[PDB]
Symmetry: C2
Subunit: 659 residues, 2 copies
C-alpha cells in the first residue's frame, strides 16, 4: 500500500471511509466506497447561500458518474462482488475500482477530471467475461437537494456516422443565483449500426437515466465510456447549450484523444516533483500533497483554492490567507503559472477590497478575511474574524511581491502587482495609530492566533503591515514612481515587543495563554523580520509548548519543522514534519484533516505548509529579497538518504541534497 | 422486552435501527437512535412533487423536537452517556429515552403527538443531578432540504404573567404548492421572573435555534417542556399565524392539561383491545398492530392512511385499496368512527372519481389506483396499475356497503353510501363487455396479483364488480330508490372461470405462474363469493405455494391464516399467521416491512391484514350480509389459552374464545 505514485484501498469499509478526490482545478469528484458511484461533485467558482454560516458556499452538484450495472438482471452491489479494490494513480489523477462479479466477469472502471477540459469528466468501464453474460448499464442524473427547478432532457445528436445520445439536466442553486447544466453521453467502440440502443427513463421528480443492454460472450472484453460536462452561469452565459456542445465535442474527440491530452497536461505538472530516497511513506505522502495542490489549482485562470480545494464544501469553498501564505509559496517555486492564477483571483477582486476599506473607514484596499465570487467579505457574521482579522491584506501584498521576485515579470508588476501593493499600503497607512513615543500601533484585531480576539498590536499582523509597506515602497522604486515617504516612516516604527523572558509577545494582552496556531514564529518564516537564530530558537521553544493537541489547525508544526531545518537540527525538524500531518490523517488514502484526529479532509492548507517544510526547510530553498530562488543551510531527516526537487524557479532548476 | 404495553430497546445500535413512530393521525414522528433527536416528521394531507414516482408525495418536515443538551459546556454524546434506553408506551404513544450523563446526572425525555391537538407535539425533559451543575439546552429548527424559501423568526409573547418565547420557521414544499409553518416554545414551572432567558441564534441559512442555561442544585430534578405546532396551507389559509396561535394556546393550557386530554383520548382508543393469554410475544405484536392503526388514523375527519401511515414517505403517502380491504375492516369492527373517516376520504373525492371515469371513457365514478389531496389519479406513470388496476372502484363500494352493514346508519347511506355505490355501479355497468354467450367480461386489467398485467377476467377484479353491482342494488332497495335492473343482470353473468382441476382461474391467461399476492383466494375472504369449503380448500392448495418468498408484500398470508381458521385448521392457521409478519420484522421494535427481509417499515397494510386474521379468523367475527357482526366457527393457535376481543360493533361486545 506504499507505491510512490498510487494510493490503494482493499475492500472499502463504508463505516470508516474518507473518499479521495480527482480534480482539474475546476471540477472535483470525491470517491464513494460503493462501486461505480461518486460521493460528491464540486464545481469551482459557483457560490450561493447554502447551509453553513448563512453566507455564500460551494454547492453539492450532480453526481454525474453514478452508474448501475446488472449482470443477467442481477444488480451489482458491495455485498455480491469480491476482490473489490480502489486505487488513485497520482501520475494522471485516475481513480480506478476493480472487482469480480461471481463466475461472470471482472469489472474495471477508471474516472478522470479531464486536465485539458476544465468542465469535462470521463469514466472508462472494462468488462472481462469468464462466462456468457448480458449487462444492463444505467447512468443516473439525480438532481441533488441543494438544487431546485430542475429539468431532465434526453436527445439524439446524429449524422451519417454517429448517434450521440445526450442525457442532460439543468437546475438552479438555492436562491436562483446560478444555473447549472450537466450533459452526459456513452462512447462505444463498435460504431453507430452495432452500438446498443439507448433508452431514457424519467420516473422520478429528481432523477432520470439512460440505459442499455449488451450481450457479451465468454472470454471477451467489452469497453464503454461515460463522458459528462458540468458548467454553470458563473462560467458561461448559456450553460445548457454549452454543456451539450462540450459533450458532443468530447464524444467526437473520443476516449483515446481525450486521455492523450489529459496525460500530456499531467506529464507537464509532474516535471516539478519531489523525490525522497530511503523513506517510502514520506515519498508517497509528499506525492499526495503535490498531487492535491496540482489537482486543486489551475494555470491561466483567476481561480484560488479554498482550504479544502475541491475535496468538498470545507469552509464554504471560500478563499483565505491559506492561499497567499500556505498553498501559494510551494506552487510559486514549482509552477509560477499556478501562483499567477492565485494572485489573479485577488487582482480581479481589488474593487471589492477598496469597497470593504471604505465601509470600515479605511483608505486603499482591505481584502476580506473570507472571499468568494465578488471579493466582498464572506465570513459568517457569528465569527469576529470577518470584521477584525486584518493581516489578510498584508498576506495578499506579500504574495503579490513574491510573485514579482520569483518571475521578475516587470510588466505584471506594473499592471497587477503595483495596483495591489499601492492600495494595500494605503490601507495600512490609514490603519495604524501614532502614539506619544512616535511608534505606530495597530489596535483592536483578531490575531493569527484566532483565540486572541479584539486585542492590540498582534505580532504577525504588525509584521505583515511592515512587509506590505516595505514591498509597496520597493515596488514604487522598481517602476520609477514616487511612494508616500510615510510608508517607510510607518514601517520602521510599527511596534513588535518582547516579554521579560526575551520572547516575542503575540499581542498587548498576552503573557502565557495557549495559542490556536503559529503567530509570532511567522516573523522568522515566512516574513524573515527575525533572522537572529537565538531569537528564532527562543520564540520556537516557548510557543511550541502553547499549541494544544485538540482543535488546532495544520498551520503551525510545518513552520516549526522549516525553522529547525534552517537551524540545522534534523531530529527536531523531522519530529515537527511528522506531527504536522500524520496525526490528522483519515483512512484509507491518508487524506489530511484540518486538526489532529479531525474528520473534515482534505485540508490542502495543511499540505501547502508541509510542502514548504520540505522545499524551503529540508531543501533550504528561499525567495531571495533581491529576486529569484537561492538556497540557505538545511539538514535532512536521519532516515532520508536523498532529497531531489525538480522544476524550481523560472530557470526550472533541479536541487539534490544528501547527508 | 415482551411487556404487553411497551416496546423497549437497550443501547440503540445506529448500524441496525429502524425507528418507531408516535402519531395522532395528523403528525408522525419517527425515532432516532441518537438521544434528544428525531429522524423524520411527516404531516398528513400535505403533498407536493418530490423524489419517487414524479407524482405528489408526503414531504419530510421539520425535525422540530431536535435538542442539544450540555453539562458545564460538555455536549451529550454517545461516548459520555451510559444505561441509554428507549421505550414506546403503546398505552399513550409516549416515546421515552433515558440515560446517565457520566456519573453526574440522569436525563429522561418523553415526546407525544398530542392526541386531541392534531397539529401539536410536546417533549417533556427531566434532569436529576447528583452535584450542583449548569445545563445548556438548545432547540434547533433545521429546514429540511425537502423545503425551500425558508424564513427563521423569533419573538416574545408577553403579558404581566407570561413570557412565551416563540421559535418559528415558515417554508415551502418543492413546487411552492404548500406553505409550512412550525412554532416552538419552552414551558417552565418556575414562572416568568425566575425562568431562564431565551437566546436566539440564526447562524446558518437552513437552521436557527433557541437556547438557555440553568443552574440545577445537587439532588434536585429540573423539568422543562418543548411544545411545537406544525401546520400547512393544506390545513389552514394562514399557517404562519395559526402555528404561533396554537403554540401560545398550548403553552397557556400547560403540560398537565395537555397530557390529561392526550391520555383521555388514548384511553378511549384502547376500550377496543385484543388480549391473548399464553403467548406474550403474540400479545405484544398484536398490541403493536392496533397501536399503529390507532396512531395512523383519526376519527371525525376525512383522513385515510397510506400503506405506511405516518411512519415515513412509503408509497408517497398515497391512499390505496390498502385502506378499504386491509386497514378498514379491523377498524370498522373496533372503532366504526375510524372507518367513517376512511370512507369520508372517498366520499369527498367522488367528483375526482367521476372526472377520472370520464377521462378513461367510462360512466359513474372510477376511483384512482392511488389517491392523495384531490382524489385524481396519482400513480407513477411507469406503473401500469394506475391506468389498468380497476378493482379499487369495487373495493371502495365494498367498504361503503360494509360501513352501513356494521352501523345501520341509514342517514349516512342516503347522504354518502348511496352516492358512492350508485356512481361505482354505473362505472362497472359501463366497464363490462357482453360476449356471444351473454356473459359479461372485464378485459385488459392489471390483476390484484400485480405481476399479471393487461390480462382478461381477473378473478378478484370480476368479484369486486359483482359485489359492487349487488351492493348498489341492495342499497337502492333499502332507500326506496329504483336501481337499473341491468346491475343485477350483469352481476349474475360476470365470468369467474375454473381450470380443469376445479381451481378458480386467476385470469384468462393463467395456468401456474407465480403470483405477487392473494387474488383468487380473496373470492373466499373477503368477498365470500366462494363459501363451499371444498372449493376454498382446493383454491388454497393450488395457490398457497404460488407466492415467492422474495419481493412479495404482506397482503397474502393473513388471508391464508383467516381461511384456515374458518376451515378449523389450527396448525395451518397459526403457521400462516406467523408467516404473515414475523419474517418482515425490523429491530429493535419489531416494526413491519412490506416484504420478507424488507427494510421499509412501517407497512400498516400488513398490520391491517394480520388484525383480520386475529379478529375475523381466530375470533370468527364476520360482517353479516344482513347487517351487524356475527361469529362463525374458528380455532385458536394450540399455545393460545384465551383470546379476548373488546369493543366490537355498535353494541361494543366482548368476545372470549378458548380451546
Amino acid at each position: 500500500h506504499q507505491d510512490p505514485w498510487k494510493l490503494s484501498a482493499d475492500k472499502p469499509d463504508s463505516n470508516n471511509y474518507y473518499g479521495e478526490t480527482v480534480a482539474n482545478g475546476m471540477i472535483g469528484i470525491i470517491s464513494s466506497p460503493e462501486p461505480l458511484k461518486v460521493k460528491e461533485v464540486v464545481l469551482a467558482g459557483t457560490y450561493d447561500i447554502y447551509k453553513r454560516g448563512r453566507v455564500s458556499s460551494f454547492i453539492p452538484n450532480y453526481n454525474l458518474l453514478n452508474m448501475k450495472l446488472a449482470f443477467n438482471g442481477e444488480s451489482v452491489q458491495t455485498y455480491n462482488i469480491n476482490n473489490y479494490k480502489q486505487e488513485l494513480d497520482m501520475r494522471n489523477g485516475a481513480f480506478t475500482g476493480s472487482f469480480q462479479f461471481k463466475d461472470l466477469a471482472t469489472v474495471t472502471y477508471s474516472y478522470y477530471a479531464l486536465r485539458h477540459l476544465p468542465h469535462c469528466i470521463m469514466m472508462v468501464v472494462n468488462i472481462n467475461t469468464q462466462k456468457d453474460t448480458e449487462i444492463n448499464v444505467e447512468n443516473l442524473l439525480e438532481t441533488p437537494s441543494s438544487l431546485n427547478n430542475q429539468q431532465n432532457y434526453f436527445q439524439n445528436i446524429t449524422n451519417t456516422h454517429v448517434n450521440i445520445p445526450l442525457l442532460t439536466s439543468v437546475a438552479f442553486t438555492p436562491t436562483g443565483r446560478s444555473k447549472i447544466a450537466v450533459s452526459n453521453t456513452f462512447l462505444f467502440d463498435e460504431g453507430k449500426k452495432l452500438q446498443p440502443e439507448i433508452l431514457h427513463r424519467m420516473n422520478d421528480a429528481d432523477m432520470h437515466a439512460m440505459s442499455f443492454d449488451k450481450k457479451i460472450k465468454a472470454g471477451k472484453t467489452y469497453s464503454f465510456a461515460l463522458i459528462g460536462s458540468l458548467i454553470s452561469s458563473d462560467h458561461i452565459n448559456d450553460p445548457y447549450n454549452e454543456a451539450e456542445r462540450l459533450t458532443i465535442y468530447a464524444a467526437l474527440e473520443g476516449k483515446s484523444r481525450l486521455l492523450n491530452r489529459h496525460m500530456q497536461e499531467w506529464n507537464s505538472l509532474w516535471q516539478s516533483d519531489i523525490q525522497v530516497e530511503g523513506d517510502p511513506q514520506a515519498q508517497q505522502d509528499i506525492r499526495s500533497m503535490l498531487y492535491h495542490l496540482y489537482s486543486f489549482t489551475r494555470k491561466s485562470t483567476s481561480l484560488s483554492p479554498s482550504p479544502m480545494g475541491l475535496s468538498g464544501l470545507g469552509y464554504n469553498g471560500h478563499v483565505f490567507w491559506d492561499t497567499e501564505i500556505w498553498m501559494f509559496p510551494p506552487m510559486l517555486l514549482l509552477h509560477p503559472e499556478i501562483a499567477k492564477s492565485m494572485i489573479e483571483y485577488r487582482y480581479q477582486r481589488l474593487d471589492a477590497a477598496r469597497k470593504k476599506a471604505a465601509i470600515y473607514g479605511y483608505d486603499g484596499a482591505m481584502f476580506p478575511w473570507e472571499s468568494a465570487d465578488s471579493g466582498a467579505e464572506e465570513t459568517p457574521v457569528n465569527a469576529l474574524t470577518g470584521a477584525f482579522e486584518h493581516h489578510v491584506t498584508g498576506d495578499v501584498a506579500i504574495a503579490a511581491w513574491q510573485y514579482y521576485l520569483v518571475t521578475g515579470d516587470k510588466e505584471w508588476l506594473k499592471e497587477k502587482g503595483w495596483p495591489i501593493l499601492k492600495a494595500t499600503a494605503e490601507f495600512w497607512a490609514s490603519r495604524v495609530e501614532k502614539n506619544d513615543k512616535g511608534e505606530y500601533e495597530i489596535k483592536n484585531v483578531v490575531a493569527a492566533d484566532e483565540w486572541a480576539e479584539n486585542i492590540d498590536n498582534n505580532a504577525y499582523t504588525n509584521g505583515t503591515a511592515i512587509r506590505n509597506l516595505q514591498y509597496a515602497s520597493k515596488c514604487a522604486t522598481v517602476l520609477g514612481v514616487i511612494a508616500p515617504k510615510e510608508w517607510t516612516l510607518i514601517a520602521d516604527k510599527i511596534l513588535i515587543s518582547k516579554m521579560s523572558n526575551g520572547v516575542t509577545r503575540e499581542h498587548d494582552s498576552y503573557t502565557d495563554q495557549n495559542i490556536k496556531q503559529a503567530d509570532a514564529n511567522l516573523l522568522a518564516y515566512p516574513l524573515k523580520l527575525i533572522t537572529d537564530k537565538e531569537q528564532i530558537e527562543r520564540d520556537l521553544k516557548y510557543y511550541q509548548t502553547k499549541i494544544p493537541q485538540s482543535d488546532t489547525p495544520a498551520m503551525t508544526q510545518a513552520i516549526f519543522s522549516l525553522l529547525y531545518s534552517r537551524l540545522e537540527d534534523s531530529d527536531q525538524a523531522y519530529h515537527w514534519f511528522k506531527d504536522a500531518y500524520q496525526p490528522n490523517l483519515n483512512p484509507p488514502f491518508r487524506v489530511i484533516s484540518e486538526c489532529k484526529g479531525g474528520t473534515n479532509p482534505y485540508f490542502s492548507t495543511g499540505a501547502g505548509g508541509v510542502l514548504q517544510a520540505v522545499i524551503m526547510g529540508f531543501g533550504g530553498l528561499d525567495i531571495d529579497a533581491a529576486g529569484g530562488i537561492k538556497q540557505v543551510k538545511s539538514v535532512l531527516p536521519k532516515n532520508w538518504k536523498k532529497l531531489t526537487i525538480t522544476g524550481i524557479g523560472i530557470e526550472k532548476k533541479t536541487f539534490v541534497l544528501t547527508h
